[PDB]
Design a protein around this nucleic acid. Structure first.
Lengths: 136, 130
RNA sequence: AAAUGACCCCGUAACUUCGGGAGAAGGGGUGCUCUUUAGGGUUAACGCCCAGAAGAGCCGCAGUGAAUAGGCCCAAGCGA
RNA sequence: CCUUUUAGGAGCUAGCCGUCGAAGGUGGGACAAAUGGGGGUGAAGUCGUAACAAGGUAGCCGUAUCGGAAGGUGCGGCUGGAU
RNA sequence: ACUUAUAGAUGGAUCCGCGCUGCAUUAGCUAGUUGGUAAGGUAACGGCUUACCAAGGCAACGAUGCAUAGCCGACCUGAGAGGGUGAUCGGCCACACUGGAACUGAGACACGGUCCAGACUCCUACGGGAGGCAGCAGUAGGGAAUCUUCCGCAAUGGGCGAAAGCCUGACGGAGCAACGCCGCGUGAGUGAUGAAGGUCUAUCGUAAAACUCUGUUAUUAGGGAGAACAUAUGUCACAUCUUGACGUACCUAAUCAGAAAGCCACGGCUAACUACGUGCCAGCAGCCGCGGUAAUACGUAGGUGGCAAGCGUUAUCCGGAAUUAUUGGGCGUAAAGCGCGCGUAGGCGGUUUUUUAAGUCUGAUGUGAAAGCCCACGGCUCAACCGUGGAGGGUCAUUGGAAACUGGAAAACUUGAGUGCAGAAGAGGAAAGUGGAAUUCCAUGUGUAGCGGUGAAAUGCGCGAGAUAUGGAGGAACACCAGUGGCGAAGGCGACUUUCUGGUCUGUAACUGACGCUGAUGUGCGAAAGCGUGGGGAUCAAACAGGAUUAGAUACCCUGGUAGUCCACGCCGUAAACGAUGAGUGCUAAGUGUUAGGGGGUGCCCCUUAGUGCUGCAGCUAACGCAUUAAGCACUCCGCCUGGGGAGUACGACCGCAAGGUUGAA
């Protein structure tokens, strides 16, 4: 803890990397290179539906979504809830980041969000997987 | 031996750890100032000055009080060749809300922590001896 | 078969057994009159021998105006 | 407001010798970017038999040599070796 | 109302200064590097092109390259240092299709100029036109949202004008996006527990009704909030017979009853209430965390904690994050200490007086403005929109007196030193091998049934090896003085016939009167093997030839077997350099084992001027250990470290005979 060589030679900070690096980004075609944006809002347009089986910690069954973002790369999602949207090819409002217990996926759906409304079997949630005009 | 008082300073508290005194130490012209201005408060058995040339010899003879307990509980210098920190005589800090004392050289003779506050004089204000 | 080719000045890659590759590749300059000073040792100094930059001008379609002088680059196979 | 006003010996803008000539134009690899096997990892039919205590040929490190992890040899600091 | 000797001024600035970021995968330095010397010229000195000559000017200190490239009143904000983004808000500057551009200006290469090269939707008897909203719109759009072509000078006059007058597209008039948040308004006097009961089976039920209260939303109405404009009016102080698109606001206004969408998880933390659906079928889940037959989580259902213009989410730095350490950083141990003999620059860099009179002590001064400052307040239906500035504008217009000192820097002190040193140690090192473990070889003094072999045997030397040694020199090591002893910085290390060699220093210090500390320049150099001579076998050890195995072997086992095993020459470096200990200043019980060698000494008692290893007082660190002979407390440098991987894999820069290094985002 000696200060001579401290202006001769400095120190570092910690070492951390931020969250969702292949997110918060809008891929170019005119100038071909991405934008570092951290946008509030964004879209999702669909390529498949997707589902993998081996689930230990829950040990029930539920699928997810394989939705591609701009212009030739693998981007993957998951539908956290009791609502099955047996759909695809949508145009939505993204939710950024991952919910607990799925590795590598960081992209999601807001309730409603211009494509569908949601799993309409919900009426008590009034704020989960599709819930609009709910008597409070 | 480049600081002629350096370790000798805390050697008060690193000699009186269990309140002990067998440590003779070497001198200065401020080892005619380090141990001579707190006898102003009855702090030493005897350091009257150094009685030799070439910055010689001195009995440290550190007075211990009536509660048996560390006259100097702890102590650091914060002023050494290699650590030069110079402040003004105004906000000379509050040395444990004023519980300690300072004995140091000034820009107008020699003072203490009883002078900087009421004379606006001093340079490298040194330590907090208690 | 054609093309490149002499001399002078720029500039020169990957690779390597550090010798090379290499004249790598790429460019640019030369006619004639007149000046200037740039030479030398052959010398008693231009007689004698030339050759060195910087400027002025004159002419043609073309100025080593004829003859004689390496075509380059990238990638495989085989044998030093 | 050049003053043989045409004009001219000079001489001013326009022709003629030129003067550098930025930029574009092409000239080379560095650069390039969606793209055009290493690994990184998957998600389990599969595989060796153990390291943890003289644990099942004791437990490890670099290295003449190892090598589907595990698994075994010479040699350097070794014990983090028990009797 | 003209032109000039002249002015106060305008953007600026001719320019000075600190303002003026990162990339070490970029030091042997650009030929102008050092600066003097030009006819020249910009309101402007002058390598600015040129004018004359010598570079080592550089120099391991960032020459230079070099990647975003505005700054600065703003905003979230700290306790404070300020610390960052500087977008509404820009006061200053880079910038108007493009390369220019002969031009020019009360201010130049000029956003609807002036020409000529380009590729654009294009207009043209194809004179050939030259235009692009980094200036309001709107079109195909890309679109989380990403706006009114509503109006036209009236809030300021630039310019033209002796003047009456303009253009506003400078500035204005706004669908307003519930974007900011507020001004507050959509129910009242309420009500006996009050029902026909919705999780639970008394709960939100003081639910309800049907009675009354406020204007404030809504039927109208008159709606004139500010404010002073102007040659001739009579003689830059200045002015009348000259200022209502929004010009209707404050709209009390009688006022009916003109509802304030709906809240999340629904337990406990992030603050939440219980359950039928649910039998692991769907499935709960801000780090913690839940359904398999009582989800005090889930589907759904009446709400308590926060709420009414508000519900879950979107992601940016702030104190919080003390996971920057300017305030607030580890060393043996997370995630961390030197191969060290070596060691440039310099961070640090003896004692005392010091010549210094710079600076700090701090300060006379200058006291040069701020709208607002460490504050508060006044105009305002309080909130959108303005203001007194006492805090002097932050060494700014003057340099100081305290020598106590980093500072133009004269010395002295010496015991702290190094060569003198008795020399003296120990495996500090270089010493041939006279002699000896003399080796598996074999006629052999001697011979044949064994030298010998084993978890399990073949391996293996006998159709003329043997047993140990009679010649037995040799390939070689001191085998025995050999100890943990101790030279030396770690790797080490063994008779000497000894060929040589330093320091180390044990006692005080003779000389000189600071005789300087970590040490990235350099140099570097450091374990068998990997490395260099051919020797290369004493022949063991790798491979293994080979047997053998409980159910399970090319094997640690086993005779023998080709690098190496017997090395005087090129350079090195990975190891548990597991020594995981980095080095200046002493240290609060000293004894103790004692070391060749010794301060007082003389198979008798010893102290460090000493040295080691310590049981361990004493006190700290962090659970532990150090300890008169200290990780503890005080001045130190190369520095690293600041939760884990993966990560040294794209890729990579420079050393280099070789293992190879030594770099480096994701």
């Amino acid at each position: 803890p000696t200060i001579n060589q401290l202006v001769r030679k400095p120190r570092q900070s910690k070492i951390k990397k931020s969250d969702s690096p292949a997110l918060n980004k809008g891929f170019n075609s005119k100038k071909k290179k991405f934008t570092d944006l951290n946008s509030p809002q964004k879209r999702g347009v669909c390529t498949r539906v997707g589902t993998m089986t081996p689930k230990k910690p829950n040990s029930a069954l539920r699928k997810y979504a394989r939705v591609r973002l701009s212009n030739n790369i693998e981007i993957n999602a998951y539908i956290p809830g009791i609502g099955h949207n047996l759909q695809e090819h949508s145009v939505v409002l993204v939710r950024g980041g991952r919910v607990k217990d799925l590795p590598g996926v960081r992209y999601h759906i807001v309730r409603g969000a211009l494509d569908t409304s949601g799993v309409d079997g919900r009426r008590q949630g009034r704020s989960l997987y599709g819930t609009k005009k709910p008597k409070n | 031996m480049t600081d002629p008082i350096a370790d000798m300073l805390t050697r008060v508290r690193n000699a009186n750890m269990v309140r002990h005194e067998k440590l003779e130490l070497p001198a200065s012209n401020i080892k005619k100032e380090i141990a001579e201005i707190l006898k102003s408060e009855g702090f030493i058995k005897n350091v009257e000055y150094v009685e030799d040339d070439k910055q010689g010899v001195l009995r440290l003879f550190l007075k211990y009080g009536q509660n048996d307990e560390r006259v100097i509980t702890g102590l650091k210098r914060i002023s050494k060749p290699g650590l030069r920190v110079y402040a003004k005589a105004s906000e000379m800090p509050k040395v444990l809300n004023g519980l300690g004392i300072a004995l140091v050289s000034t820009s107008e003779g020699v003072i203490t922590d009883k002078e900087a506050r009421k004379r606006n004089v001093g340079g490298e204000i040194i330590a907090y001896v208690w």
